[PDB]
Each structure stands twice: as C-alpha cells, then as structure tokens.
Design an enzyme around this catalytic site. Structure first.
Site, short mmCIF file in Angstrom:
data_model
loop_
_atom_site.label_atom_id
_atom_site.label_comp_id
_atom_site.label_asym_id
_atom_site.label_seq_id
_atom_site.Cartn_x
_atom_site.Cartn_y
_atom_site.Cartn_z
N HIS A 36 41.90 41.83 39.27
CA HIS A 36 40.85 42.50 39.17
C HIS A 36 41.04 44.08 38.57
O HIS A 36 40.46 44.94 38.50
CB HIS A 36 40.04 43.22 40.96
ZN LIG Z 1 37.72 37.92 45.90
#
Ligand SMILES: [Zn+2]
Lengths: 542, 317, 388, 182
Positions: free
Chosen positions: C135
């Site tokens: 992320h």
């Molecule tokens: Zn996740």
C-alpha cells in the site's frame, strides 16, 4: 422504420424524465459534442437489452483515445523534479512520477467504512490482541536473553583488564539496532531506561549480569503469566470462535421469523410473476406456467418432518386434546393424499398432471413445508461427507496429553462421533422442540458439527410451530376446510384431467372473496416434481 | 468458564495498559552510586497557534507571511490587527488623519488607498465566496468546513445508519436477505431494473438467486448491480449517478473541449428563455424538454430532426 | 514439477509491534516460520536470511526525503515532527513505532533478495514472508504499509527479466504497485479485491493504465463472502489468459490471510484450500514466481495458510494434524491445520463475474549503496532451533 | 452599495471553488498570462478604443491601484487553505533567490475575479466617499465587460489530466496532507 424508431423508443422508456434525458443525450451527440464511442456507451445501458433495436441503430448510424479512469489523475511536471538518488535510466523509464493516488479522492471527502462484525468476532479480535502483546513481549525478551547470553559467554573466557574497557557501538555486536532498546525501555521506567541502556552501552560486564538476571526473571514471570492466562483464553475462545464464524446464523433467529411470513412470500412470488410477464412481453406473447419449482428426491424427509410435528404435538399446552388429534391426523393425511403416498411406512416404532387450487393460508403452509424440506435436503446432501469427517476426527495426540480439546459439549452427550449425523440431528431437533436443550448449546453443536453450514436449522422448532399454527387454520376457517373437502371430492387418482379442473377453478373462484389470493400448485407423480404458478386476479377480470 | 479474577495475573494486568511493575520494581544498583479551537480564518482544524492577548487562533499556513513548525518564531506572537490594536497606530500615534496621510503619501491612489489601508488592519483568511455569488446558483451549498457541494454530492449519513445500524444490515445490503430494498414505499410496487426487465427478488429458500438493486439519486430509476459494472452500493461521497444522465464534462478529440455543463441558474430574471428556431441552432447543448446562459425551449421533434440531419451530413464522410 | 524454493526469514522481523489495538501485526510471520520448521520441510528446502536494506538501496522507488524520514523517525520526538508526517501520512493512519526503519529495511532486503535469487537462477520459487507491503506510495504511507518493497522486487526482476507480473489475491489491494507501474508496458499488474467503499477505493474496470501502460492494469473487484468455487472461476480462466497473452517471465504473488473467511477489516469468505489452490494453479505453469506476505489481520488462520502455502510450494501435501510448537495455543479448539470457512452470504453473483471477465478479456485482447545492489548475497542462517 | 457580475464570471468562480475545495486542483502560476499583463492589455485596448477626453489618467490610476491592490490582497482574502502551501513554496524560493515576488507576475486572472467578487464587502467596510464609490463600481463594470469580450482566449476549459496547460494543476497527496491536514 426510421419514423417509428423514436416512438418505439418512447414506448420502451416509459418514464418521461428518462425519455427527456435520452433526448438530451441524442442532442448532445447532434451538436458535435458527443462522439460515437460515448453515444454507443450510453446506448449500451439505454437500449442494450433490445438486440433488434441495437442492431438496427448500429447498422443505420454506421459503426464498424485513453480510458482515463476516475482515479490516478495526472500530476504537474513541477512535482516530478525530485532527486531520488538511487535511480538509474531503466528505473526512470519504468516508473511514473506524475501519477499519484490517495484514498480521499476515492472517498470524495467522505471517508471509508469497515465491515461490521459481530460481538463474538470483536471479542475474538480482542482476545487475539491480548494474546499478541503477552507473547510478543515474551519473545522479544528471549531474543534479548540470547543476546546478553552471547555477551556473557564472551565475557566468561576474558580477563579483567579488557573487562574494564569493552567499548561497543549500539547494537551489542548484532545485526539488530533497537530491539533491546524497546525491551529495556518497556521493562524499566521511561527516564531510567535511557540511562541504564547508556550504562549498558559504554560499560558492559558490570550492568550486563544484573540486567540479564532481571530480564530472566521478567521472562519467567511473563511465561507463567502467559501459562495461567492460556487456560482461560482457550476456554473463552472455544465458545467464542464458532459463534464468531456464524454470520447469517447469528441473526437467523430473527430473520427467519421476519421473512417466513405471509406478505414476504406473497411479494416473493409476485416478483417472479411480474418478471416473467414483462420479460416475455419483451420477448414472446405466450406465458409460461411454471415458477419457483421444488424437487423431492428423498422420501424419508417427510417422515422426519412428521416426527418433528408429532413431537411438537405432545409438547404444546395452548391447544386441546381433540384439537391436537385432529391437527396431527390432518397433517399426516395431507401427504397421505396430496403426494399419493398410500400410507406412511414409518408409522410403526422408531417414530417419535394434478392441479391444486388453494387460498393464501394453504400457500403459506406449503411454502413453509417446502422450506423445511429444503433445509433437511441441504442437511442430507452433505450428510455422507460430514458424518465421514466426524467419524475420522483425528485428535492431536499432543493436545490429548496436555488437555486443550474442546470437551464442552462432550460431557452432556452433544458430540456426534459414533453415530450417523442425520439421525443425531433428528433426535436433537426432537429434544429441541421438547424444550430441554438450552438453545445456545444446540446452535453451538451445529456450529462444531457441520462446520457452520447448518445455519438454517437453528429455528427448526420455530418453523415447526409456525407450520402447526398455519395448519390449524385449515380446519377452523370455513373456506379453507371447504376447499379441503372439495379436494377430497376432487382427488380420485383417475384420468380426469383437462376437463374437470376448469369447473374446479370457477367453483373455488366463486367460493372465495375478491381480496383472497389464488394459487395453482401443480404436483406431478413421476420424479416427484411440483410447480406453483401464480394466477392472482387473473380469473375475476373476465 | 473465563476467570478474570485469579488467572489474570499480577505482573501483567489487562493488556493495552501498564502497571506499577515498571516503576516500583525498577531499582538499578549496577551504577554503584484566551484561545480558540476553530481557526477563524478558514473554518477548519489542524495545528494551531494563538496570541496571548487575542482569542483568535490561526493555522501555520493561513498567515499572510507563511511560516512552518520547524522554524516557528520565538517569544510572543501577534496577529496583523493585533499589531494594529495593542501596538502602533492604536496606542501611540493615535489615528486622527493618517488615513488621509496614506493618500497624501502614496501618490493619489485615493480610489484604492482606503482599501490599501484596511488590508494591513485585517486578519488574513482563506478565500470565501460572497453570498451574492452563492444565491444565483441554488444547486450549490456550503459544507461543514466550507467546501464546494452541488447536487452531485450525497448528504453524509448520520451515525445511526452508520455505526449503530445493527448486525444484519451492515454498511451495505451485501449480506443477508433484504427484500425491503426491492420495494419502494411510495407506491408499494416492485423496482424493475432498467437493463433487464426483472426485479430478481429471488427466494428465501434460495437467497443466491437474489440480485442486488439500487434506486437512483436523481430519477429514482432502479438498476441492478450486475448490469452496470459496479461492485457494491454508493452510500457516502457523491450521489450515485446512474449511467443514463448527461455527464457534467465530456471529451471529444479533434486539442479538446471540456464543456463543464452550464451549472444551474435560480428562477429569476437572469434565467431567460427564447424559442424561435428549431433547425440548425448550434446551441452546444444545455437544453430542457417542454411539451449569456440562455436555454431555448427545445422539443422532441427538433431534437430528432437535427439528429437525423447531422447523421445525414456525416454519413457521406 | 520439482522446484527449489528460497525462503527468506529473519528472527527480528516479528519483533516490531505497530501499537496496541492494531490490525497489522508482523508477529504472525515468526509463528508461521515456526510452522514451516516444525513440519520438517527443511530437508527439501534451502533457507537464507536476507540482510537489512540501506538508505540508498531503499531509494529505488521512494524519494530521498521520505526515506530519510523513515530512517530518522521515532515516537519519542513525534511532538514537533508534524510537518513531514502529514506529508507522508504517518502517525494518523499508520502510527510510528520503534524499529520502523529496521522493519522496512528487512522487508525490502527480503523482497530484493528473493528477486535476485529468481534472477540469478539458484532457485525457482522465492518466498519472503518477512515483507509483503503493497500500500506504500512514492511519498505516502497507507494501510499500515511504509515501504513498497514489491516495487523494488519487480525492479530487481526487471534488471534481468523482460516482463514481470504482479498478482494480488487479498483484500485491500496494492495501489502503490499499480501506481508505480501504470504507464509502463513491461510490467502488468493483476489484482483481486473488493470494491465499494473499501479502504483503498482504487482499481476500476476502466483502470487499465495510460500511455504505454494501456491495458496493462487488471482489476477484478469482488463483493462480500466470495466462496472458493466462484473464486476459482474468477481466478483460473483469467490467469490462464494472462499467461497466454502477456507471457510474463516472473510472477510476484502477494499472499496473505486478509481474503480469508475471518478477518478484521476483510470481507471475503475464502477457506485455506481456496486460498492455496490458486497459488497451486499459478505454480503449475512452471515459470519462476516470487512470494511475499503482507496481508492478514487475523493471525491464527494466517500462520496456517502461510504454512500450507509453503507446503504446496514444496510439492508436498501437508497433513491436517498440527504438531506442538511454541505457539500451539493460538489455533482453534479443533487444533487442526484447517481454516474453517464462514457461512456468510455469497452475494457475488455469477453474472457480474461473467460481465467482468468479458470486459477484462476485451481489455486484454490488445496486449499480446547500489554497490550492494543486485543483491544476490545473504547470510546462510541455517542454524534455526525453532522446531519444538 | 450593490455590484453585479455577469453570469459567465460567476460560473467561472464557482468552477474555481469546485476545483480547489472539491476537485482538489490548484491554479498554475507558471502560465502564459498574468494579472499585470491583464491590466496592461485592458488599459491599452480601452485607451486605443475610445477618444482622449482625460479618462486615461484615471484609467492608469485604476490600473496601478488594482495592480498594487492585488499585490496586497493575495494573502488576505484570496488563497484557499489548499493554496497556502503553494504560496509558501514560491515565497521560500524567492527568499532563496533574493528577489521579490509580487503576485502580478505569476498569478492568473481567476484570483482577480475573486477579488472583484469580494469587492462589495470591502467597500461596505470602509467610510469611503460616494462619487468615488460610483466611479470605482463603473470601472469595475467596464473591466468586467472587457473580460466578457475576451473570455474565450482567457478562461478556456481544459483538463490537466491530459494537457500540459490547463490554468490548473492537480494537487499531490503530500501537498493535500500538508495543506488540508497539519
Ligand atoms: Zn488489506
């Protein structure tokens, strides 16, 4: 047909606002604003279903850029000018510095939500984090213990002269940088930890033995703390985890009562009606006469439902004795006549085309019976695998020695080993209707028996009671009993179809009121097929 | 049989917390001896700096001369009108005619010199649209912190539907049977999907045949979640615009033209109408159907006429 | 068939805790590694410990000031360290903990060491459970992820391989990798996750890249409670079409228990068999693959599925019996290697999946110091006593 | 005291508000045309359009006053909280370059439209003479209709997602976290 294409589209649209908006789209295309791609994309939702109209439009118009999705908008070149020293030419040519994503643009300045979890799942995450912090501290402590043990071993074969001068950089001669920092900061005070780790950094072998002993006894006390927390942790998780895995079954006790009602099933079949009518109006004028069909591959399931029914007969106290006798006899006779079963072959020990036109009460009664049949059907269809898996439940011998198995249901005989699962859940439903099962134990046994797949049998007593109450209206209500009596007259097991059901139809239609719902339940003898076709207000109009 | 009384230990109590073990049992003998919280310049939140004798608080970036937290000034800090109230031009050298001295000194800028005066005697602030700019566009409104919000943005959900919305419902209908979403309370009929003419309510005995449907935020047109490519519902953010309405901005490549609509004008004299011509108007859209920012009264006949005219021009190409 | 598998473990990677009440938990990797050692898999496997990454070796995707911030961060002086945090969104959604720099270093070192072992040819399958963060952006930390080590691994793979494919199978998909490989044609990113007010909120059917990276970004949004059969139907045909069309030279697979039946902020209903059979299918192709672990907010199921992942990558079938380890009490009351799927609703209709598949095929038919860089050297780390 | 604005400029201002607050898009200072040449072109075109009865003196007075007035109001009622960081970067750059940044050299006419929109509030907040107010509002109307007649070459709708020049640039995640955050 270019003249009537617009009128055909207007008839297909229906809503005035949608027609005006389609007009606006067509005009936007007509003013050199909308290209062919956007027009065809709009038509894909507008007239996608009408294949003939779509083909005509594509042939008449004459059909034979970047996607630029909602996220990842282009950054200016000013933000690209950043050093990023560890970069070479191919790594420049693969990575883009002018495209960035950030979740608030996706949320449109509104944030995001998490998936709602039950209280059992919430306390499972809770017990997980309590279990996390304990052993995380414990095993950071074992790493610090082995580091100081290597240090002490290096001291043990070394003399005082270089014991006085043993200057070391941060890290204590290991690849790690700050884990001991965390450990001795957590064990001691905030301000004291920095000074004692300073003394450990610049003067080892004087503070190192005593901090090793202190950390070792910290380790031992954290270990026995984990040990006596382990038992209560496991006993709590044994009843929490399986209930946490149940998501639909937790609310099944209320959802079953909410959705197994008269109006919900009425809406359920009228939706299938109206979908069939308008879909065929789109496609073809003749209408089918089959919808919401059920299959009956097993014959003993009705006998199981009879066992549940007369188990509930002798348990309730709100009904009279001849009332109970008549209701039980009628419930048996309903399959003794309608499904062409000559007699129930289980009525001894070990027991505790044709058209039907009926009102709303019989429809709800048959819908609950089909629902209970389907519940038992997905019980039985996985029975041969679940019973096998329970039969060879390989208990771990290590867990046998130090007692971590879940023996919560095994003391009272709720376990399923050494017995067929289907007969066991039949007996469990008998004692469940009998009201001496402490329900939560019953759904817990279902959770640890069929791997949470038996969530539809949680309210088996509730649906049985609803079935009994709906069958009670088959005799007290005069219209329903009259319909049943002329089904006694109608059912003859003879070739009398296609000329005797019509007078039956007008006779019941004159028999009931205008507001009462009308149902054609067609039963087929071969392959045990059934069909319920909706004819609501389709006979009194003309 | 959980026992948090005796099995909960003494050295380590209930976690996500600490105990007296790290303070009392920590002996080492190895060393052998007025302000506001709203930032009334942009009506937002963040890192705040305040004045000693002024209740107004500002942001680090919402100051005429921008400053950063890494090099914040030392000592007392003062705002602009703070520098002109407790300091010069209001305590000594009292304001008698210095406003006219501004004109007399800065080369006859009198048509702007009084505004040059109260620039310095004014607290810095973020841009705020005037109220007379707001009223001519009724579709737009000011949000909680002061952001743009037309009718495209959905009203934020209250916490009752958001946190304490039970377990069976959840944030979205993606779980359990919810037949109430397929029936509208306006008339009690069934929401027929636009693409496929089916409600697809399904059955309780077979929940998997149920197809999720949603109403539109503009025209209340039902739409299945499987027909239009979309994973789940739309509850927070912009209003769910069904793929049947006019886009706010379209792209045609010839560099390009955006055509970000023409907003919406409230019902007064600026909203002026003129139907005179139907054929070849070249009015670049922005129309309304009947049975400057001018909007001509366009009807169905003219739209279908000029559409046919244009596709008869373009098919020779 | 038979393939040598590289495992990259450090004894320190599980020693970092993000904080109290935190979903992300690196401590699951330690008991996962304990599960591999306790299963006797070391006899048909070779394992190395990857060295921690340096500042400049971590700069291959992230900017200089972001790496400097990650190196010099500390919760003690977080009071005045407030400008940068908001710039890199650290401390608001991703709290600052002790050893963040070292954890990022070991994660990146494991990722690029697996990539270098794939490139050099000493191994066929690279497993790095120590770091699977996906992320992280260029200068933004999200999803409790700080360094985007998958991008560095893909870069090291591209130093030798012409085409690298990244596969994401868990919820909270990797938006940083797709952002980093949105305009390039030599990198193709395929992901399987849920859309609809989810925490990433990124990845559409129209999100297929721009410029030279057009039709090179595959996003398959799913819904709540997708079971194993429909996950197989949405995985195997599209993966076969990706292998037939794109023809990658290396595969980066993001493994984790986020998409399992039980999860904190997850939404799927995948069992362990469903989560492992997809990896078995993509391993059956025979091309080199890279395995990372950076998903799974539950722990008890995550250790078991990672152990089953390693067992299937070792071309053996692990028994359901669970031997005694020093984390033996975490597992369920049955105490078997069995992640039990939940009974939640499978709202993922077949028609929506078929429409997504058809439009994805419609998109894909047009495809057809750095001194220590290169990595390819590590400590042996063969003396592991984690067996119990 | 009332001032009217043509609806095109009001729509432009509303689009600017949407771009900044909702769409998170800041204006591009490295652009082709700035405020100083806006007023220079206005003065030149009006002077060469009409005769010379003495209006050029007050015309140049209005132009210089508006230039300096823009120089002061840039950090006072303009510059949404998103754009304060973007001011800070170039002000720090001018501090490093040892040159003085007056806003009329980089800022476009959209902030001039903002100042014209907020003009009635500042007019009503002063004790300032009536005929001066009338001539100021008349010059404001003349500037507004002149901007109307040159609206295509000045405010052209362009998306920065695919074009180099769109009088607006997209805000980065770090910029948003600093500006709208802390
Ligand atoms: Zn996740």
């Amino acid at each position: 047909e270019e003249v009537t294409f617009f009128e055909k589209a207007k008839r297909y649209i229906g809503n005035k606002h949608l027609y005006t908006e389609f007009l606006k789209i067509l005009n936007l295309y007509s003013q050199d604003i909308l290209d062919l791609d956007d027009l065809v994309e709009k038509v894909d939702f507008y007239l996608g279903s009408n294949k003939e109209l779509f083909t005509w439009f594509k042939n008449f118009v004459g059909y034979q850029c970047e996607a630029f999705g909602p996220s990842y908008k282009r950054l200016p070149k000013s933000d690209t000018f950043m050093p990023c020293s560890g970069r070479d030419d191919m790594c420049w040519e693969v990575l883009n510095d002018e495209w960035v994503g950030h979740p608030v643009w996706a949320s449109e300045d509104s944030g995001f939500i998490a998936h709602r979890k039950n209280q059992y799942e919430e306390t499972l995450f809770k017990i997980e984090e309590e279990r996390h912090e304990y052993d995380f501290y414990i095993e950071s402590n074992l790493r610090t213990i082995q580091c100081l043990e290597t240090i002490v071993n290096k001291i043990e074969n070394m003399t005082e002269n270089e014991k006085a001068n043993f200057k070391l950089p941060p890290g204590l001669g290991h690849t790690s940088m700050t884990i001991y920092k965390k450990v001795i900061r957590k064990v001691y005070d905030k301000e004291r930890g920095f000074e004692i780790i300073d003394a450990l950094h610049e003067h080892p072998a004087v503070t190192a033995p005593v901090v090793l002993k202190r950390l070792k006894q910290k380790d031992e006390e954290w270990r026995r703390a984990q040990r006596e927390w382990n038992k209560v942790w496991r006993e709590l998780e044994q009843k929490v985890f399986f209930k946490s895995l149940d998501h639909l079954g937790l609310t099944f006790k209320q959802a079953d009562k909410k959705l197994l009602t008269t109006k919900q099933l009425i809406s359920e079949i009228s939706s299938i009606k109206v979908d069939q009518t308008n879909k065929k109006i789109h496609w073809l004028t003749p209408k089918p006469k089959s919808q919401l069909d059920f299959d009956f591959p097993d014959k003993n399931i009705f006998y199981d439902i009879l066992c549940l029914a007369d188990t509930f007969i002798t348990h309730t106290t709100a009904y009279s004795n001849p009332d109970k006798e008549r209701l039980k006899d009628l419930l048996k006779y309903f399959i003794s006549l309608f499904f062409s079963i000559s007699f129930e072959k289980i009525e001894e020990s070990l027991y505790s085309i044709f058209n039907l036109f009926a009102n709303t009460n019989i429809y709800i009664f048959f819908r609950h019976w089909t629902t209970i049949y389907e519940r038992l059907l997905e019980i039985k269809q996985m029975n041969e695998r679940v019973t096998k898996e329970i039969n060879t439940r390989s208990t771990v011998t290590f867990a046998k020695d130090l007692d971590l198995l879940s023996s919560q249901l095994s003391e009272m005989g709720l376990d399923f080993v050494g017995e067929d699962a289907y007969k066991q859940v039949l007996r469990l439903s008998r004692r469940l209707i009998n009201g001496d099962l402490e329900h939560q134990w019953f759904e817990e046994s279902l959770r640890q028996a069929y791997n949470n797949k038996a969530f539809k049998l949680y309210t088996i007593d509730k649906v049985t009671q609803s079935l009994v109450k709906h069958a009670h209206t088959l005799m007290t209500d005069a219209k329903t009993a009259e319909i049943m009596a002329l089904f006694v007259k109608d059912r003859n097991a003879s070739t009398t179809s296609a000329k005797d059901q019509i007078i039956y139809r007008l006779q019941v239609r004159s028999h009931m009121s205008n507001t009462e719902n009308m149902f054609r339940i067609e039963f087929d003898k071969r392959t045990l097929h059934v069909s319920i076709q909706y004819i609501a207000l389709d006979d009194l109009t003309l | 049989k959980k026992r948090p009384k005796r099995l909960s230990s003494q050295n380590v109590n209930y976690d996500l917390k600490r105990r007296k073990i790290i303070t009392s049992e920590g002996i080492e003998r190895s060393f052998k001896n007025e302000n506001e919280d709203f930032c009334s310049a942009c009506n937002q939140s963040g890192s705040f700096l305040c004045c000693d004798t002024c209740p107004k608080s500002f942001h680090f970036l919402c100051l005429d001369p921008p400053i950063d937290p890494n090099n914040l000034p030392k000592g007392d800090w003062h705002c602009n009108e703070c520098k002109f109230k407790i300091f010069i031009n209001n305590s000594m050298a009292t304001l008698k005619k210095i406003e006219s001295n501004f004109i007399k000194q800065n080369n006859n800028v009198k048509i702007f010199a009084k505004l040059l005066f109260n620039i310095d005697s004014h607290n810095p602030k973020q841009f705020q649209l005037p109220n007379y700019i707001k009223e001519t566009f009724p579709a737009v409104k000011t949000g909680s912190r002061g952001q743009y919000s037309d009718e495209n943005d959905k009203i934020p959900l209250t916490d009752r539907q958001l946190f304490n919305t039970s377990y069976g419902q959840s944030i979205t209908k993606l779980d359990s049977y919810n037949p109430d979403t397929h029936i509208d309370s306006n008339s009690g009929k069934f929401l027929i999907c636009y693409k496929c003419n089916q409600t697809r309510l399904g059955s309780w005995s077979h929940p998997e045949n149920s197809r999720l449907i949603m109403t539109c935020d503009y025209c209340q047109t039902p739409w299945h979640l499987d027909c239009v490519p979309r994973a789940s519902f739309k509850n927070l953010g912009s209003k769910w615009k069904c793929p049947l309405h006019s886009p706010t901005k379209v792209y045609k490549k010839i560099n390009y033209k955006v055509w970000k609509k023409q907003r919406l004008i409230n019902k007064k004299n600026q909203l002026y109408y003129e139907p005179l011509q139907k054929i070849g108007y070249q009015n670049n859209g922005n129309i309304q159907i009947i049975p400057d920012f001018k909007i001509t009264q366009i009807d169905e006949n003219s739209i279908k006429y000029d559409f046919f005219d244009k596709i008869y021009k373009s098919k020779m190409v | 068939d038979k393939r040598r598998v590289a495992y990259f473990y450090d004894a320190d990677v599980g020693n970092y805790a993000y904080g109290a009440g935190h979903p992300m938990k690196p401590h699951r990797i330690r008991m996962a590694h304990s599960l591999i050692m306790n299963y006797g898999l070391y006899k048909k496997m070779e394992i190395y410990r990857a060295k921690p990454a340096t500042k400049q070796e971590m700069c291959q995707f992230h900017t200089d000031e972001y790496i400097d911030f990650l190196s010099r961060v500390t919760p003690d002086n977080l009071e005045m360290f407030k400008r940068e945090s908001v710039k890199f969104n650290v401390g608001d959604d991703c709290p600052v903990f002790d050893g963040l720099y070292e954890y990022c270093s070991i994660s990146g070192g494991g990722s690029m060491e697996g990539a270098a072992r794939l490139n050099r040819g000493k191994c066929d399958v690279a497993v790095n459970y120590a770091g699977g963060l996906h992320h992280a952006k260029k200068s933004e930390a999200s999803g409790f992820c700080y360094l985007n080590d998958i991008v560095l691994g893909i870069i090291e793979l591209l130093r030798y391989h012409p085409r690298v494919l990244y596969i994401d199978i868990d919820v909270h998909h990797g938006d940083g990798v797709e952002e980093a490989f949105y305009t390039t044609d030599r990198v193709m990113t395929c992901s399987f996750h849920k859309y609809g007010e989810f925490f990433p909120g990124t990845g559409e059917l129209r999100d297929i890249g721009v410029g030279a990276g057009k039709n090179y970004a595959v996003n398959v949004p799913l819904r709540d409670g997708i079971d194993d059969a429909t996950y197989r139907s949405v995985f195997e045909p599209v993966i076969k079409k990706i292998m037939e069309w794109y023809q990658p030279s290396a595969v980066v697979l993001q493994c984790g228990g986020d998409s399992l039946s039980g999860d904190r902020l997850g939404c799927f209903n995948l069992s362990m068999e469903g989560h492992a059979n997809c990896v078995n299918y993509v391993k059956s192709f025979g091309i080199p693959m890279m395995v990372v672990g950076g998903g799974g907010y539950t722990m008890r199921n995550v250790a078991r599925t990672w152990c089953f992942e390693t067992g299937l990558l070792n071309n053996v079938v692990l028994d359901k019996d669970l031997p005694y380890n020093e984390y033996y009490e975490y597992y369920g009351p049955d105490y078997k290697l069995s992640v039990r799927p939940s009974n939640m609703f499978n709202v993922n209709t077949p028609e929506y999946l078929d429409k997504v598949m058809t439009n994805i095929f419609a998109n894909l038919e047009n495809t057809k110091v750095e001194e220590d860089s290169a990595e390819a050297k590590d400590t042996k780390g063969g003396s592991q006593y984690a067996r119990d | 005291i009332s001032l009217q604005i043509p609806i095109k400029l009001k729509s432009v201002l509303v689009d600017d508000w949407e771009y900044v607050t909702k769409d998170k898009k800041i204006c591009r200072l490295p652009a082709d045309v700035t405020v100083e040449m806006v007023l220079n072109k206005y003065e030149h075109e009006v002077s060469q359009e009409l005769e010379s009865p003495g209006s050029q003196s007050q015309l140049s007075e209005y132009c210089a006053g508006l230039k300096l007035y823009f120089d002061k109001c840039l950090g006072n009622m303009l510059l949404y909280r998103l754009e304060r960081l973007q001011y800070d970067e170039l002000l720090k750059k001018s501090s490093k370059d040892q040159k003085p940044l007056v806003p009329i050299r980089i800022y476009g006419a959209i902030h001039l439209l903002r100042l014209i929109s907020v003009l009635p509030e500042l007019i009503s907040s002063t004790t300032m003479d009536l005929q001066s107010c009338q001539l100021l509002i008349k010059q404001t109307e003349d500037f507004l209709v002149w901007l109307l007649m040159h609206v295509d070459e000045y405010f052209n709708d362009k998306d920065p997602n695919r074009s180099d020049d769109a009088l607006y640039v997209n805000t980065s995640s770090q910029y948003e976290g600093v500006a709208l955050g802390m």
